[PDB]
Amino acid sequence: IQRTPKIQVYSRHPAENGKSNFLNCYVSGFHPSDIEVDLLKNGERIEKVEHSDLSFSKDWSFYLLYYTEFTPTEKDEYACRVNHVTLSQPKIVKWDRDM
Amino acid sequence: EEAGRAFSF
């Protein structure tokens, strides 16, 4: 019937404070395909986040990458916020540079 | 390249 998204928040390259990077949120393993994904900087929605074209795995579950340029600092906190029909409340996953 | 046409269920 329905499958809840797996969520990973991570950078394209190893994070180095003050160095330009890409912030990624990869959602996968979900069904149906409608999903709402935001990238947050210090709790606020980053504008103009882009995403990949809708694709799916061998088990028919969907995956999408959302991404934006970002320059990490020591101070700035980042997260991904995801809602899907399977979730009561939006789910927030914090970026941790060792994950 | 894709096939010429898909098929009706």
């Binding site: 797996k6 395909s33 809708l54 | -």
Partner: protein, 276 residues
């Protein structure tokens, strides 16, 4: 090496919000090369890889026409599934298709596919013989009988043995710089105390292509499947993929643990440890 070409359709009904959206994406191996979206301002097949950009304007018109025709077919397929499953016209539903071909190093057909799902469940699948079907239920059996009557499998077989392998061959040559280059993972083990007497060892693989990889932890040379946390392989966004595997270990025992890495880009499997 061995290669695949796959096309994936997703057709999504949305009662009250227009006709069902139809998206096609095409892949060689783990590289997206074309897309089509019925919700685009001017729906066309569009290139998504540089090596496909040389295909002539006739290629683009033909491929676009095919997708426009298939948008209609899959919308009809959605209406049909509603009937076969006795469902109301109020709910949103999804049909998906995957079809394509695998080839070996010599470029000959290894295996063809053409299968569909309905609301994320198997619906019908062309068998490996490229001549017969597997239907998941009595609804898909009606489609099977219709496809047997119309000799659809013969049409699939001709495509899968012909155009599918021939076009994939041309793509592999045109994109040889990238499609036929494997990038090995960049690897490292990190160490982080959880508490006084527990540490997390995390084995990292970064920057690799294609996506397929194996990462395992052993303790005194034995596999730790149950105790390993293994994330799904994830796209970096620069064509490459990432993965990690983590194990929680007693402090003082780090050297009993080895991370093992297999990837097509590696001449031999790698063994690494935490290197203080």
């Amino acid at each position: 090496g061995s290669h695949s070409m796959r096309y994936f359709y997703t057709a999504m009904s949305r009662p009250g919000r227009g006709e069902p959206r139809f998206i096609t994406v095409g892949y060689v191996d783990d590289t997206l090369f074309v897309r089509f979206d019925s919700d685009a301002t001017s729906p066309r097949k569009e290139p998504r890889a540089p090596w496909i950009e040389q295909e002539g304007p006739e290629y683009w018109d033909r491929e676009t026409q095919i997708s426009k025709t298939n948008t209609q077919t899959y919308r009809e397929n959605l209406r049909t599934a509603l009937r076969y499953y006795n469902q109301s016209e109020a709910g949103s539903h999804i049909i998906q298709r995957m079809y394509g071909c695998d080839v070996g190093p010599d470029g000959r057909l290894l295996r063809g596919y053409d299968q569909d799902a309905y609301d994320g469940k198997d619906y019908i699948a062309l068998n490996e013989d490229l001549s017969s079907w597997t239907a998941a239920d009595t609804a898909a059996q009606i489609t099977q009988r219709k496809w047997e009557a119309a000799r659809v499998a013969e049409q699939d077989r001709a495509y899968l043995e012909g155009l599918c392998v021939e076009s994939l061959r041309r793509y592999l040559e045109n994109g040889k710089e990238t499609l036929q280059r494997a990038d090995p993972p960049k690897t490292h083990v990190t160490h982080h105390p959880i508490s006084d007497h527990e540490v997390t060892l995390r084995c990292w693989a970064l920057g690799f292509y294609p996506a397929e990889i194996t990462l395992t932890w052993q303790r005194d040379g034995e596999d730790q499947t149950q105790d390993t946390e293994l994330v799904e392989t994830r796209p970096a966004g620069d064509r490459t993929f990432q993965k990690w595997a983590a194990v929680v270990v007693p402090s003082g025992e780090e050297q009993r643990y080895t991370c093992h890495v297999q990837h097509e880009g590696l001449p031999k499997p790698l063994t690494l440890r935490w290197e203080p």
